mmCIF file of all heavy atoms in Angstrom:
data_model
loop_
_atom_site.group_PDB
_atom_site.id
_atom_site.type_symbol
_atom_site.label_atom_id
_atom_site.label_comp_id
_atom_site.label_asym_id
_atom_site.label_seq_id
_atom_site.Cartn_x
_atom_site.Cartn_y
_atom_site.Cartn_z
ATOM 1 N N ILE S 332 -1.669 -13.538 15.153
ATOM 2 C CA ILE S 332 -2.388 -14.786 15.306
ATOM 3 C C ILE S 332 -1.508 -15.779 16.044
ATOM 4 O O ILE S 332 -0.420 -16.118 15.546
ATOM 5 C CB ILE S 332 -2.801 -15.367 13.940
ATOM 6 C CG1 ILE S 332 -3.601 -14.334 13.097
ATOM 7 C CG2 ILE S 332 -3.651 -16.610 14.140
ATOM 8 C CD1 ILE S 332 -4.098 -14.904 11.812
ATOM 9 N N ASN S 333 -1.935 -16.179 17.233
ATOM 10 C CA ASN S 333 -1.197 -17.181 18.082
ATOM 11 C C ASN S 333 -1.384 -18.609 17.720
ATOM 12 O O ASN S 333 -2.060 -18.883 16.721
ATOM 13 C CB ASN S 333 -1.570 -17.081 19.547
ATOM 14 C CG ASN S 333 -3.012 -17.430 19.803
ATOM 15 O OD1 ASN S 333 -3.719 -18.059 18.989
ATOM 16 N ND2 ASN S 333 -3.468 -17.011 20.935
ATOM 17 N N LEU S 336 -4.610 -20.193 17.029
ATOM 18 C CA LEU S 336 -5.221 -19.803 15.745
ATOM 19 C C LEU S 336 -6.347 -18.820 16.007
ATOM 20 O O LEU S 336 -7.441 -18.909 15.438
ATOM 21 C CB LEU S 336 -5.727 -21.020 14.969
ATOM 22 C CG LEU S 336 -4.705 -22.132 14.830
ATOM 23 C CD1 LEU S 336 -5.331 -23.232 13.987
ATOM 24 C CD2 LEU S 336 -3.320 -21.695 14.294
ATOM 25 N N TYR S 377 5.661 -10.772 11.939
ATOM 26 C CA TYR S 377 4.771 -11.889 12.227
ATOM 27 C C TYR S 377 4.456 -12.811 11.054
ATOM 28 O O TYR S 377 4.481 -14.096 11.205
ATOM 29 C CB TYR S 377 3.507 -11.341 12.819
ATOM 30 C CG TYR S 377 3.654 -10.738 14.201
ATOM 31 C CD1 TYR S 377 2.773 -9.744 14.630
ATOM 32 C CD2 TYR S 377 4.605 -11.199 15.116
ATOM 33 C CE1 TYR S 377 2.860 -9.193 15.908
ATOM 34 C CE2 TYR S 377 4.687 -10.662 16.410
ATOM 35 C CZ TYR S 377 3.804 -9.677 16.806
ATOM 36 O OH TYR S 377 3.853 -9.154 18.088
ATOM 37 N N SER S 378 4.171 -12.206 9.884
ATOM 38 C CA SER S 378 3.482 -12.942 8.804
ATOM 39 C C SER S 378 4.232 -13.239 7.535
ATOM 40 O O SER S 378 3.712 -13.935 6.663
ATOM 41 C CB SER S 378 2.173 -12.256 8.463
ATOM 42 O OG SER S 378 2.361 -11.084 7.627
ATOM 43 N N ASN S 379 5.504 -12.842 7.435
ATOM 44 C CA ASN S 379 6.222 -13.128 6.178
ATOM 45 C C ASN S 379 6.396 -14.571 6.036
ATOM 46 O O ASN S 379 6.226 -15.317 7.012
ATOM 47 C CB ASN S 379 7.522 -12.331 6.034
ATOM 48 C CG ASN S 379 8.676 -12.954 6.750
ATOM 49 O OD1 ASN S 379 9.201 -13.926 6.304
ATOM 50 N ND2 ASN S 379 8.998 -12.436 7.892
ATOM 51 N N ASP S 380 6.698 -15.069 4.842
ATOM 52 C CA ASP S 380 6.876 -16.583 4.726
ATOM 53 C C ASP S 380 7.769 -17.256 5.757
ATOM 54 O O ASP S 380 7.553 -18.387 6.071
ATOM 55 C CB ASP S 380 7.349 -16.976 3.333
ATOM 56 C CG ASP S 380 6.346 -16.591 2.270
ATOM 57 O OD1 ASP S 380 5.103 -16.573 2.543
ATOM 58 O OD2 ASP S 380 6.778 -16.285 1.143
ATOM 59 N N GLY S 382 8.347 -15.672 8.764
ATOM 60 C CA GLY S 382 8.047 -14.957 10.013
ATOM 61 C C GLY S 382 7.766 -15.917 11.150
ATOM 62 O O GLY S 382 7.382 -17.077 10.948
ATOM 63 N N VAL S 383 7.925 -15.432 12.368
ATOM 64 C CA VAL S 383 7.754 -16.332 13.531
ATOM 65 C C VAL S 383 6.322 -16.860 13.714
ATOM 66 O O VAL S 383 6.139 -17.892 14.371
ATOM 67 C CB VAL S 383 8.136 -15.634 14.827
ATOM 68 C CG1 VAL S 383 9.656 -15.327 14.847
ATOM 69 C CG2 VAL S 383 7.284 -14.382 15.030
ATOM 70 N N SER S 384 5.302 -16.185 13.164
ATOM 71 C CA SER S 384 3.931 -16.665 13.393
ATOM 72 C C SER S 384 3.260 -17.226 12.142
ATOM 73 O O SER S 384 2.033 -17.458 12.116
ATOM 74 C CB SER S 384 3.100 -15.577 14.020
ATOM 75 O OG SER S 384 3.686 -15.021 15.180
ATOM 76 N N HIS S 385 4.053 -17.456 11.097
ATOM 77 C CA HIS S 385 3.486 -17.647 9.756
ATOM 78 C C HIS S 385 2.492 -18.779 9.637
ATOM 79 O O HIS S 385 1.482 -18.676 8.911
ATOM 80 C CB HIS S 385 4.606 -17.904 8.771
ATOM 81 C CG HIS S 385 4.139 -18.219 7.390
ATOM 82 N ND1 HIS S 385 3.701 -17.244 6.506
ATOM 83 C CD2 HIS S 385 4.087 -19.391 6.720
ATOM 84 C CE1 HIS S 385 3.344 -17.824 5.367
ATOM 85 N NE2 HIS S 385 3.565 -19.124 5.476
ATOM 86 N N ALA S 386 2.834 -19.900 10.284
ATOM 87 C CA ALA S 386 2.099 -21.121 10.181
ATOM 88 C C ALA S 386 0.637 -20.886 10.744
ATOM 89 O O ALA S 386 -0.351 -21.522 10.342
ATOM 90 C CB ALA S 386 2.824 -22.244 10.970
ATOM 91 N N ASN S 387 0.556 -19.995 11.710
ATOM 92 C CA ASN S 387 -0.698 -19.638 12.332
ATOM 93 C C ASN S 387 -1.647 -18.952 11.372
ATOM 94 O O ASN S 387 -2.849 -19.181 11.438
ATOM 95 C CB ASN S 387 -0.424 -18.725 13.506
ATOM 96 C CG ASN S 387 0.421 -19.405 14.600
ATOM 97 O OD1 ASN S 387 0.978 -18.741 15.475
ATOM 98 N ND2 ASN S 387 0.423 -20.722 14.601
ATOM 99 N N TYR S 388 -1.094 -18.109 10.497
ATOM 100 C CA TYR S 388 -1.896 -17.458 9.460
ATOM 101 C C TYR S 388 -2.440 -18.503 8.502
ATOM 102 O O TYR S 388 -3.679 -18.597 8.240
ATOM 103 C CB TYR S 388 -1.096 -16.336 8.750
ATOM 104 C CG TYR S 388 -0.844 -15.185 9.626
ATOM 105 C CD1 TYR S 388 0.060 -15.266 10.652
ATOM 106 C CD2 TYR S 388 -1.536 -13.991 9.473
ATOM 107 C CE1 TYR S 388 0.302 -14.202 11.512
ATOM 108 C CE2 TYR S 388 -1.295 -12.903 10.331
ATOM 109 C CZ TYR S 388 -0.380 -13.023 11.350
ATOM 110 O OH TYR S 388 -0.121 -11.998 12.221
ATOM 111 N N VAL S 389 -1.530 -19.322 8.004
ATOM 112 C CA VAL S 389 -1.926 -20.459 7.167
ATOM 113 C C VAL S 389 -3.012 -21.351 7.789
ATOM 114 O O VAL S 389 -4.021 -21.709 7.110
ATOM 115 C CB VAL S 389 -0.669 -21.339 6.836
ATOM 116 C CG1 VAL S 389 -1.038 -22.547 5.953
ATOM 117 C CG2 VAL S 389 0.421 -20.512 6.115
ATOM 118 N N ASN S 390 -2.798 -21.764 9.053
ATOM 119 C CA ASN S 390 -3.715 -22.695 9.679
ATOM 120 C C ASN S 390 -5.070 -22.055 10.086
ATOM 121 O O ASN S 390 -6.139 -22.718 10.058
ATOM 122 C CB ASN S 390 -3.069 -23.411 10.852
ATOM 123 C CG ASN S 390 -1.952 -24.349 10.438
ATOM 124 O OD1 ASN S 390 -0.965 -24.513 11.138
ATOM 125 N ND2 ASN S 390 -2.072 -24.915 9.333
ATOM 126 N N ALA S 391 -5.039 -20.776 10.431
ATOM 127 C CA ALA S 391 -6.231 -20.085 10.907
ATOM 128 C C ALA S 391 -7.273 -20.008 9.851
ATOM 129 O O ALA S 391 -8.415 -19.949 10.231
ATOM 130 C CB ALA S 391 -5.925 -18.693 11.421
ATOM 131 N N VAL S 392 -6.882 -19.980 8.553
ATOM 132 C CA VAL S 392 -7.809 -19.804 7.438
ATOM 133 C C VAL S 392 -8.086 -21.066 6.650
ATOM 134 O O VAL S 392 -8.794 -21.046 5.613
ATOM 135 C CB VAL S 392 -7.342 -18.701 6.437
ATOM 136 C CG1 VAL S 392 -7.010 -17.466 7.190
ATOM 137 C CG2 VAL S 392 -6.139 -19.118 5.612
ATOM 138 N N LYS S 393 -7.545 -22.164 7.169
ATOM 139 C CA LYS S 393 -7.455 -23.403 6.435
ATOM 140 C C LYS S 393 -8.763 -24.175 6.329
ATOM 141 O O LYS S 393 -8.974 -24.896 5.358
ATOM 142 C CB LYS S 393 -6.391 -24.311 7.043
ATOM 143 C CG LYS S 393 -6.095 -25.488 6.134
ATOM 144 C CD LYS S 393 -5.081 -26.445 6.694
ATOM 145 C CE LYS S 393 -3.728 -25.795 6.556
ATOM 146 N NZ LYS S 393 -2.706 -26.608 5.831
#
Side-chain angles (χ1 to χ4, degrees):
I332 306 184
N333 65 18
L336 310 183
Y377 292 154
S378 79
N379 83 75
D380 298 329
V383 294
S384 307
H385 175 78
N387 298 164
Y388 291 72
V389 180
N390 293 145
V392 310
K393 191 182 285 235

